[PDB]
Amino acid sequence: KEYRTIKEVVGPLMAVEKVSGVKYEELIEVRMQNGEIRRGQVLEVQEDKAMVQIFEGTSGINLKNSSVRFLGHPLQLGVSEDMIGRVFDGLGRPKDNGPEILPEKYLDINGEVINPIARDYPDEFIQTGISAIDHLNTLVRGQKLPVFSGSGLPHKELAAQIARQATVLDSSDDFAVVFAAIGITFEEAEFFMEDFRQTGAIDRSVMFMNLANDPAIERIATPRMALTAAEYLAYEKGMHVLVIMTDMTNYAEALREISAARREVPGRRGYPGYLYTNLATLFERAGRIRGLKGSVTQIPILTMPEDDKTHPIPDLTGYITEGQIILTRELYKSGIQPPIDVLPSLSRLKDKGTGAGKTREDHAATMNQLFAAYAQGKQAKELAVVLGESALSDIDKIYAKFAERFENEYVNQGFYTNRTITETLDLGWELLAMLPRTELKRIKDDLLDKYLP
Amino acid sequence: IKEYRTIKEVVGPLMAVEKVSGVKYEELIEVRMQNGEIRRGQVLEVQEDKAMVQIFEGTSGINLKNSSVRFLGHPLQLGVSEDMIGRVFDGLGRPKDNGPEILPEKYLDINGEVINPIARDYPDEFIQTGISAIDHLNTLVRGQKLPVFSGSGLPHKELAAQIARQATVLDSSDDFAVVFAAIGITFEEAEFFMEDFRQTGAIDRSVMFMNLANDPAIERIATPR
Amino acid sequence: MALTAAEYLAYEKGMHVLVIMTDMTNYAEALREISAARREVPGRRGYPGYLYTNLATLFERAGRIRGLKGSVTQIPILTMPEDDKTHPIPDLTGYITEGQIILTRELYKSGIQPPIDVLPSLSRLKDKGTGAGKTREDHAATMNQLFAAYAQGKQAKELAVVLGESALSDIDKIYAKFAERFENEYVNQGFYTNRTITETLDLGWELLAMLPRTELKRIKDDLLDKYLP
Amino acid sequence: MQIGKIIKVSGPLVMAENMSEASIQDMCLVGDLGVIGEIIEMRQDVASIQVYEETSGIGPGEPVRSTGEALSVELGPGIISQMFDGIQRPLDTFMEVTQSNFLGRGVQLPALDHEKQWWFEATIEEGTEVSAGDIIGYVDETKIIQHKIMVPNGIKGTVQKIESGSFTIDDPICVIETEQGLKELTMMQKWPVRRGRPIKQKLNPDVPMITGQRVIDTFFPVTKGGAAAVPGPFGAGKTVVQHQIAKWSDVDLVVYVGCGERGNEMTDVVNEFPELIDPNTGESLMERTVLIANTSNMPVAAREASIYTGITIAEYFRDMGYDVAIMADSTSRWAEALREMSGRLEEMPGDEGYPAYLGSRLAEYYERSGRVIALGSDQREGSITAISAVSPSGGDISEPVTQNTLRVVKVFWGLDSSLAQKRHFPSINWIQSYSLYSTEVGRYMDQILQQDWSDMVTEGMRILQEEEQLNEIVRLVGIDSLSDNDRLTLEVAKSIREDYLQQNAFDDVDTFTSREKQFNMLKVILTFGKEARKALSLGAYFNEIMEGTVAVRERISRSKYIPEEELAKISSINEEIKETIQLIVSE
Amino acid sequence: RRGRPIKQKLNPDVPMITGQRVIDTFFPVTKGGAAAVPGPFGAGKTVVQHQIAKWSDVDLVVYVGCGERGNEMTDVVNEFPELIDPNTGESLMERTVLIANTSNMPVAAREASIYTGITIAEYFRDMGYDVAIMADSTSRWAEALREMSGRLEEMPGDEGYPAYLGSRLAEYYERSGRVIALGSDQREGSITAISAVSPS
Amino acid sequence: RRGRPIKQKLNPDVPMITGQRVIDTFFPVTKGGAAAVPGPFGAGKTVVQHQIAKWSDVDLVVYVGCGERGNEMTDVVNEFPELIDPNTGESLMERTVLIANTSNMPVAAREASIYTGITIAEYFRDMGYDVAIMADSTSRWAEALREMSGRLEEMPGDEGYPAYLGSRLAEYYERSGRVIALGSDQREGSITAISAVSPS
Amino acid sequence: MRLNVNPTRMELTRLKKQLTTATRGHKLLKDKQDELMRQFILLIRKNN
Amino acid sequence: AEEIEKTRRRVNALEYMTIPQLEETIYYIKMKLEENERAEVTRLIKVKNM
Ligand SMILES: Nc1ncnc2c1ncn2[C@@H]1O[C@H](COP(=O)(O)OP(=O)(O)O)[C@@H](O)[C@H]1O
Ligand SMILES: Nc1ncnc2c1ncn2[C@@H]1O[C@H](COP(=O)(O)OP(=O)(O)O)[C@@H](O)[C@H]1O
Ligand SMILES: [Mg+2]
Ligand SMILES: [Mg+2]
């Protein structure tokens, strides 16, 4: 049923007349006079007509001699067991030159809302290999922990480093890593795909790639595809899944574009009025479920415009995600890799994955000690450069010597240097050993002499 | 009287009536809902056979095809009488003290008229409020506009009630009244006034208009008028 | 009407025309009046989205052309609203024109005539403009030195009036003293006094003379000795 | 019912023709699926509908059926010990029938159990004439609660047919004969959520609510029918506070409303609440609690209509003569949903993008809470005490939501993060916090206890306030000037900080404190610094007493853990402190 | 407005010779990299791009001047024939291609100037030459799009700019970089983008 | 709305004697000059303008009560006829013309009050007299323009005020000054404009 | 008491950082002032 | 003694001039963009209603 009734063309928007049975957000494709085939989507449908937006642009179309076909279905995704290892686009089409998969079933990428009473809260600790993340702001399964970066802060190295080193411990369940890429430069895209190939993580992960020049309407669909794929691996295959999305700032910029297309008036800071809700729709889809052995964990990455948290992108994200991992320009320009600053960083469910059974029995006790000692050391450092070295009590001077040794040896491991949890914990002791036995008032008599050098 | 059954459309708190005639700007209306409920409203603008109105209580629950609009042929009025002294009213002049109803001497537009600047007489007379800081350093004069700038938690409630009962005019004027107006205040704040007025006998000298926070916003702006 | 008459006298009649337009601000106000009347989609501060283009169609109408002896040089005057450089009118003008001359109330209140703040001002044709043949060869090195010196001197003066003169270093007070003397005589010359380029250059060295040679790392050492007092 | 036809679909906006018999703000099922929606506008017979679930797959031509009513709730037996969403959908019943762990579109199902049978006990006698609110009989849903079935609004007359037995909610258990006709009454009534339930008279909340938490009841008390705002940053342990409030407070029922909260915060509320235990009965608290749960990804309307659903259910038990306590968290998330719905309607925004009616909408809510006289010849009184939580943007209380809240409430419990790692439990800043009921409560607790309790509290806060100013100035020149006369008040204030304001809610005794216990406790610390001020004015320098009073400071906080019956020790602490300073006054 | 086809695309490795000590040392751009020069008027955005055009170690340069001063272009044609510098033994005009669009030129022609200068660059890229394209200024392109967006009464994005600004800019930069041309000769060609941004 | 014709304008070079030490000494105003008095409430905008109306060395004074307090005009019609200067024997009210459109009076008539007073001031200016007009306040005039603007569904404009606000103001103050009235006499007259601005 | 108008957005948060540095500095110089004074008074009594 | 005065000057100059000028500026800056934000939002509604 191909209609040759194209009435209007304004911008990327196109108007089709004399139609029926057409649904909202229904996928369409337009056959041109030259034969070129472009896809589209119904943005608005009235009683005897419908508005559609073409993904591949509107350049060079003759309205009289072109035709439109309605496929009678929304953006769906091909679900298959044989999916891991291959690289896809924003729409789900293969990009890896491999054997085209036969899907088990097609599902709507929007998904459904999980029943509050159905939700089962997460307990299992997840190891990412990064000390600053695996000890001070520990990641737990089913958690939603984002990463706050800036233009040029190595958030792409850390993104690669996580999925490579991210591993469940002991649990006989296999580990899935649904990676999703949003509106990124080719180099950044090529970087990630290559890096996952060589590390063998490609055979342990699923990849959804979306370049910057790719149409904005599929930039918005890219996460929804990955999350639907991630939900296909956890809840219907019983696998522990980890999701990584980059960039999330690019997702919003593309989300803004189709709003002006619908001529919808922006709510705040130029971003639409459903930004918070639209984020929650694809963020809040993570966690364990009662009765099922699945697991969905998200690590969304976003670049704060000009290093500001009060910006709508990282601010609204905070109301949805539990905690945040923040990279600092001052750290990266000092050679710290990864440039994670632990003071503004936070994990709201960290204690759920600490303690005996998940990690070493001093995990929580140590964590707060290193943390409080860092702040004190930083304050000793700031007073030192203003009043001289001598104004310091020489144990405030060792707190200062502690605080830079803390960043250079503990925080800075390297983007290609894996650190297991045990190696990180006794490392803290090795640094806490600098401090005498007198100040360590966060640790008890079982643990202080059971582990301290 | 005029009763029209034709409502073109209802959008939010705003209602549109068609096939209308003899309707004026700011004219008052009454909506006869299908469930018999009567809601009051006001004409915001009128053009040709169409008049745009706004409903005080709101447009919620109204069936257009079975509701009618009556235009009262007069703006928002107030029934005035000398018997208003000692009484308590709501934001729209409707009684609230559950006392006997009042037969108004006449009705007046709450907008009133502007005093001719020539006919004006410079205030020029003293009012004793009782509060020394005012009566001496910031004296209140008969006909003056003297406001109180306060803040949250600050005892401007206690100050107002104090002036309400303490303020009298010297020279033994047997006629001195207090019109106390409450705008969008909580229940307990309203009860504070009405209780203090009765127990100090200030109610016998005062006329009270009490409007609450949950009350319609239009009622809140019509209360001082 | 003015720029057309300018390009007519300068090109067809080969005259040398100097274009003075004020107030340029009132021009952009007029455009916004028509724009707001036409219900057009408004840009910043309600001004038309095509303000940059329309302004350009005025300022670009200047220069010299091959074969024609005449010239049209243009000096527009605009009052910055809010005394704000980032306002649309002074912003767009600055991006179009070949530099700008800036006045400041701080200098004007100080009794400086003319009150020209030399730091945020600019000329984009000073390169090929001056050097040997048209001026003295020190003309390029003197201005670049005076800039760096005033930039350091003025900032030192700021620190002086709040932390005390005895809180500066000896070389700081040398620049701070220089910065003040810079404003009072070099910048301030009176509206009815004509300085030839020679007198200016001569005065230029005199004012920067009160500094050690070791600090001036922006002037040729062979150039120094010859023109240094 | 009349069926409509969709003529336009664009995002959440759906327009359908042939809706002439429909009303404004009516609920309606949209499309083939049957998703719920609200009628916002209507021109001619064309009604504009805001669909609250996603409209993907919906197109023109599809039917639109109106429910005939605005958003309401089912009020009757089977409501207590249940967990719904914002629009009263039973989450466990949802899972059972739909056989899914998810929430699908167009899934409508009853809120109460209509198949469940209850035993009704008629206390009303045939022949008498009833009015709105009059109890006809009762059903013991779950003791502690007796679900008192009463006459709905809009009906009155003589009752003819009635006696007890086993029925369901649909079964007409009674017959009234109004002059209009003979209408039978079921034991369930439905009521709109954006309209408050009628009362005879609203009264002042003058009776203090016994929570047992010292920091609250003494300095910042909330009466039965009052309202309190709590800002909960992370780490402050706001959840611990809410639980203690729900369990220990002398209220009859509890209504929890989770509005658009995190997924990893909502099931905590869900699963940790049956774990709570009711002291008076020793059974789970859920037998006493109706719970509303929603997440940040749930339909935007359910999030907005959350607090109205709960307050309507609260007003229902309020009319029974019960004392209800409705807890909302977060109302700042509720307003962040109300803001969004405004944007969809293209309404001209107010402060920070919030609607211009944010204050009114908030005022409408809290004014429905309070001590009232319920309808009925019995003239029984009930109360709704509102506890609402806010989550400010930067700890800023000048933000529109918090600001508009404090405009219509009289109690503020500020949870400070700075006090959290100071291990101050509960983490309530005694300085910024306030309660306008404090004076009225003072007169109440003065009489009922028959002591000068209000004077003790006034003294308590005055000392602590001085500690603040002292701390500002002691920040200068260190401890110097020693100011032993000032330094004394610090040791009193330091005490007042630990003995009273601090209380571990997990300690079996330090979790609850009755009135007479609180009185005896504060009396010690007050008389300490009083007798300490005595020896100060008599010429005795006082660190020499600080050493002599080591033996009493060991008991002033042991009194904190002193059991209920043994207040005898918590009274001898007070004339003991007399001899200590006296023995030190002899030197 | 159509990207010239390629076999595949490479990561730019070879550093360029700007001659400017600041950028060649601390903030270097590879052959086929994307550099942006944001700065207010008078900061020297044009000067920098002129200095790069003069002394770059590339084989061809396309100086695209849209929405900016006319004298700046007449300056280039007056001097570049007279300047001489390796790797070419001859003049610089035998290496450069100019696309001039003054600020008082038609507004719609600004977007054209950008898309023509990059297509000519892609052309010599397909030969195997290393080419650098200087867009001065890219803000003018955006301001040009802002007018047409306003005149079309379209729903604007941030600061009045079209909501499709971010996507249209991405298309321009994802049409550069080191790649290998078509055929099977497999010559490598790089397009370096030196964009001048002029924020208000 | 149309200014009364004159032969030509003249430079205001003769200072006015207001009797206010701060004004006449440090910030004087000439006959034909214009002065603005911006200030918050209670600063003394009205008092200052009353002083000029009382003591200035002019032939006539035209006071405009533009959208301000009614008592402030009642205060004038009472006190002025009782203020006699020692030389004439006659009162101050015999040289003044009052225009009063108070705040609660119809907003649209605020603009009329401004234009009515200045035209009357021009009428006696043509008689060769030195007139001084007081506007209190001009802010209420601009607020009136903004009201009618929104009703007319016009577009801003700055801070809600219409785009033609500045013009109306510029047109107004340009009607004052030292002029040569029409006629063979070529007599000289002037209008000194004192305007109170009430900034938020 | 207003300095000069430099309207920018990231400048606001950098200014908040500058504020905290000023408070840090003010704090440091205040208890440095007392410690310098501490020894000053000590030495005066020796001086006199 | 001399250095006390220098430090005293700096503390005073920092506390009385620097800090209050900062606070009052960020407020006036915050108010500006607060007004600018919604001044555009209204205009956008006009664009929406074309
Ligand atoms: N690198 C530089 N070296 C010397 N002078 C410079 C330099 N950059 C800019 N200038 C001076 O600043 C002026 C501005 O040049 P231009 O590049 O047009 O600024 P922009 O491109 O930022 O508008 C030039 O006329 C020049 O005199
Ligand atoms: N020149 C003055 N001399 C004495 N008092 C003055 C003077 N100017 C103003 N005031 C006082 O300030 C108050 C404000 O006067 P007014 O001119 O009405 O303020 P504004 O017009 O600026 O609102 C007056 O009541 C008066 O007491
Ligand atoms: Mg340039
Ligand atoms: Mg005045």
Author numbering:
A (entry chain D): 3 to 455
B (entry chain E): 2 to 226
C (entry chain F): 227 to 455
D (entry chain A): 1 to 587
E (entry chain C), F (entry chain B): 194 to 393
G (entry chain G): 1 to 48
H (entry chain G): 157 to 206
From the manuscript:
Next, we soaked the crystals of eV1 in 20 μM ADP, and the crystal structure (denoted 2ADPV1) was solved at a resolution of 3.3 Å. Two ADP:Mg2+ molecules were bound to the ‘bound' and ‘tight' forms of eV1, as in the case of 2ATPV1, and induced conformational changes with the crystal packing rearrangements. The eV1 ‘bound' form did not show a conformational change upon ADP binding (r.m.s.d.=0.48 Å). However, the eV1 ‘tight' form changed to a more open conformation (AC from ACR; BC' from BCR) upon ADP binding. We designated the new ADP-bound ACBC' pair of 2ADPV1 as the ‘ADP-bound' form. According to the observed conformational changes, the DF axis became tilted towards the ‘ADP-bound' form to maintain the extensive protein–protein interactions between DF and the ‘ADP-bound' form. The last conformation of the AB pair (eV1-‘empty'), which did not bind to ADP, also showed a cooperative conformational change. Specifically, Eh-A (AO) and Eh-B (BC) of the ‘empty' form were attracted to the DF axis and the ‘ADP-bound' form, respectively. The wider conformation of the resultant AB (AO'BO'') pair was most similar to that of the eA3B3-‘bindable' form (AO'BO: ATP-accessible state) among all AB pairs (r.m.s.d.=0.94 Å), and was thus denoted a ‘bindable-like' form. Based on these findings, we inferred that the structure of 2ADPV1 corresponds to the state of waiting for ATP binding (that is, the ATP-binding dwell) in the rotation.
